[PDB]
Amino acid sequence: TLKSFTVEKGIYQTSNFRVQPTESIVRFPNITNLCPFHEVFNATTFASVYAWNRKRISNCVADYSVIYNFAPFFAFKCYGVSPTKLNDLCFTNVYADSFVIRGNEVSQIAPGQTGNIADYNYKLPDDFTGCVIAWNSNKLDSKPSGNYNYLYRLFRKSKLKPFERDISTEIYQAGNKPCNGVAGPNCYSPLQSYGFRPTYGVGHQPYRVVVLSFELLHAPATVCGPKKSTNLVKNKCVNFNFNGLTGTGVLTESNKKFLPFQQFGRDIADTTDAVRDPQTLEILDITPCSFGGVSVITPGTNTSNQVAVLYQGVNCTEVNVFQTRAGCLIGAEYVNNSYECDIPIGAGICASYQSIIAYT
Amino acid sequence: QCVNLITRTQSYTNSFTRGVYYPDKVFRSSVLHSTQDLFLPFFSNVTWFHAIHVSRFDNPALPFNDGVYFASTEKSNIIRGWIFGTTLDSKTQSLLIVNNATNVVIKVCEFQFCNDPFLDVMESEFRVYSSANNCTFEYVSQPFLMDKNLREFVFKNIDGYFKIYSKHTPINLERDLPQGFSALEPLVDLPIGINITRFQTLLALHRSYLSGWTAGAAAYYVGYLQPRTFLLKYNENGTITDAVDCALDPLSETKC
Ligand SMILES: *[C@@H]1O[C@H](CO)[C@@H](O[C@@H]2O[C@H](CO)[C@@H](O)[C@H](O)[C@H]2NC(C)=O)[C@H](O)[C@H]1NC(C)=O
Ligand SMILES: *[C@@H]1O[C@H](CO)[C@@H](O)[C@H](O)[C@H]1NC(C)=O
Ligand SMILES: *[C@@H]1O[C@H](CO)[C@@H](O)[C@H](O)[C@H]1NC(C)=O
Ligand SMILES: *[C@@H]1O[C@H](CO)[C@@H](O)[C@H](O)[C@H]1NC(C)=O
Ligand SMILES: *[C@@H]1O[C@H](CO)[C@@H](O)[C@H](O)[C@H]1NC(C)=O
Ligand SMILES: *[C@@H]1O[C@H](CO)[C@@H](O)[C@H](O)[C@H]1NC(C)=O
Ligand SMILES: *[C@@H]1O[C@H](CO)[C@@H](O)[C@H](O)[C@H]1NC(C)=O
């Protein structure tokens, strides 16, 4: 500090003592109001690909772990986002689209793909942000007589735009002559039936597909991943994250009676002095960890190399140890005798070299 | 089923020191805190509306402006909620707040509102709106109109959140905008994210069963918030017991 190899006799303020944080405590409100993924990925009846079901998802917590563990998935392809980061991301809206297709066409449910399903039944945009999930549904959707309740659109005048649905059953007119709304030669009904049977090859077995589309808008994002409760540790210097408010401090018990709306507390000087725990509605007094001004008391180097350390403002129990009003003095022995001041320690206490002694 | 039944008259009164609310959720004890926010100015001009139905359209939609201070001395049953929006038709989203004794339902949908919307008592919302479509929000909670008693609300639409503040202050023979300070506790913060420029009050009408509806009167006060700097006094327990409006007069300005 003094930029010299020889130190003159005196007390020099050289450093700041700090109490290092020991643990990290993150307290967040209880997980509740989870998004109804269990009603999308586990439905008694799914929908035809032409009349694909769309559920808007808003104002809930998105627990994707239940989606992960629901079934073994033929594809969990995610476009524009990684699967792991989804929980730590918060999106304004989540759209869940549910339909049943044959296995061969599962590849068609992707950006930039072509087929009967992509052109005429369900289309994803090139810039799509979301995931496509598919799983086998032989037990649920296959009958030996044949399941004729799943339909697809084979014929349409123009390709579908992304996120568009056509429910029209109008006869597809492939020829110059008018159909007249009655099926006739060169006139074919657009919706064909997926005649699912249990003994079909894996390419043709029914597969249930759920498409999750995530969109962000200027409105505040209200669908975000689960918040970890973690645990609460008190009476120690721990880094605290309470509802996105961060710091480092001891959390002692509080006698302050908060009103129910209030969540945080502030000092006269606009520094946080209190908080309400989200998990349990209790009030805690946030006190920052101890700090001190480390001062080195030394005589001249030539005379001796012994030093004493004064922690300014720090009680002795929080760091030849003596307690002074100035702070805790370590390395000097208190002597009852009174002498003239040689090195001032403050608060009526002075130090001298005879070992290093401290006296009034 | 839209019918015009309500006629409205208006008078002017003094705000006094009503309309103070807690600007944030921070607990402050034994301090003087100066905050700049949308507040109702002290001793401002407040419109007193008398809505009468006796057994043509005379109940126009009020402008929301930057926020609204609402007060009523009527019982909980007569006034049942509010309507918020811009066009108040199917094209744009709208916010409907409806209270009944068991609970409060706050719902945001594309309501095609009637010119004179009222809840008729079972309770039917057919009068309130002909149709509701593309509904995007629903929140159900304990009611804030419960049972002489002056009920005060402050509505703000800031940064896509609809902040609602409320207080229930008993009053005696003294005029319905009383003296003194009743700080308004924050009640419900809603992430509606919609544009609100106009609002209307919802009243309840009873069927006559004998002049289809029973005759009724409702009195309510509307004031408008302005961007103002206030100095609030926080006591030992965190309650706001006093405030000074800085721009109102030189003495308060010196205090601020
Ligand atoms: C008061 O409002 C609540 C909420 O709108 C009504 O409660 C609902 O009543 C319907 C009956 O049509 C039930 O299907 C719902 O399950 C109820 N919801 C809740 C949250 O309870 C209640 O009926 C209304 N009371 C009156 C007298 O109108
Ligand atoms: C999921 O589907 C199976 C099929 O029978 C059922 O047993 C289970 O209860 C369902 N789980 C949920 C959470 O719906
Ligand atoms: C959250 O969980 C705790 C412990 O399970 C419980 O005591 C508390 O009532 C719950 N709810 C809230 C709003 O804190
Ligand atoms: C309130 O406004 C009305 C018209 O807007 C006006 O006539 C009246 O004088 C105002 N009140 C006061 C106290 O200025
Ligand atoms: C609103 O409703 C109409 C008819 O129900 C529909 O055409 C339109 O796409 C809807 N818009 C949204 C955003 O849901
Ligand atoms: C809010 O609505 C008003 C009334 O239609 C309109 O003039 C204004 O431009 C709207 N604000 C925005 C940001 O769209
Ligand atoms: C504040 O709380 C204390 C403790 O409950 C109570 O005695 C006192 O009356 C309250 N009000 C004021 C103005 O101090």
Residue numbers in the entry:
A (entry chain A): 302 to 620, 641 to 675, 691 to 696
B (entry chain B): 14 to 23, 27 to 71, 78 to 143, 153 to 178, 187 to 249, 256 to 301
Which sentences did the original study use to describe this structure?
The XBB.1.5 variant of SARS-CoV-2 has rapidly achieved global dominance and exhibits a high growth advantage over previous variants. Preliminary reports suggest that the success of XBB.1.5 stems from mutations within its spike glycoprotein, causing immune evasion and enhanced receptor binding. In late 2022, a recombination occurred between Omicron sub-lineages BA.2.75 and BA.2.10.1 resulting in a new variant XBB.1 and its further sub-lineage XBB.1.5, the latter of which rapidly became the most dominantly sequenced lineage in the United States. We find that while the XBB.1.5 maintains a high binding affinity for human ACE2 as similar to previous variants, it has a diminished affinity for mouse ACE2, representing a departure from earlier SARS-CoV-2 variants.
Despite the measured decrease in XBB.1.5 spike–mACE2 binding affinity, we were able to solve the cryo-EM structure of the XBB.1.5 spike–mACE2 complex, with the aim to provide a structural rationale for the decreased affinity. Three-dimensional reconstructions, with both one and two mACE2 molecules bound to the XBB.1.5 spike protein, were resolved and our analysis continues here with the slightly higher resolution one mACE2 bound state—with direct parallels possible for the two mACE2 bound state. As expected, this assay recapitulated the previously reported enhanced mACE2 binding by BA.2 spike as compared to WT, while demonstrating substantially decreased - though not abolished - mACE2 binding by the XBB.1.5 spike.
